[PDB]
């Protein structure tokens, strides 16, 4: 799992990480991701973030983590 487990479990592509806390202009990975290489690429081929975050879907903003060692 890319993401931790609990309250940050769902990986997405963000636009932007507001203060370590946001993700703002969320997208879903339209691939799986299966590790942690693969997560940073494809959302660096979206000019994204990658993030952990409290939802799964597409949304304005949402509370989120960095993905680990990002
Ligand atoms: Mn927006």
Same mark, same amino acid.
């Given at each position: 799992?890319? &993401?931790? =487990? $609990? !309250?940050? @479990?769902?990986?997405l592509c &963000?636009?932007?990480?507001? !203060?370590? !806390?946001?993700?703002?202009?969320?997208? =879903?990975?339209?691939? /799986?991701?299966?590790?942690?290489?693969?997560?940073?690429?494809?959302?660096? @081929?979206? $000019? @994204?973030?990658? !993030? #952990? #975050?409290?939802?799964?879907?597409?949304?304005? /903003? *949402? *509370? #989120?983590?960095?993905?680990? $060692?990002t």
């Amino acid at each position: 799992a890319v &993401c931790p =487990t $609990g !309250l940050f @479990s769902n990986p997405l592509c &963000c636009a932007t990480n507001v !203060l370590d !806390l946001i993700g703002v202009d969320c997208k =879903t990975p339209t691939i /799986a991701v299966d590790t942690g290489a693969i997560f940073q690429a494809h959302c660096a @081929s979206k $000019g @994204s973030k990658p !993030l #952990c #975050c409290v939802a799964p879907v597409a949304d304005q /903003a *949402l *509370l #989120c983590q960095k993905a680990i $060692g990002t």
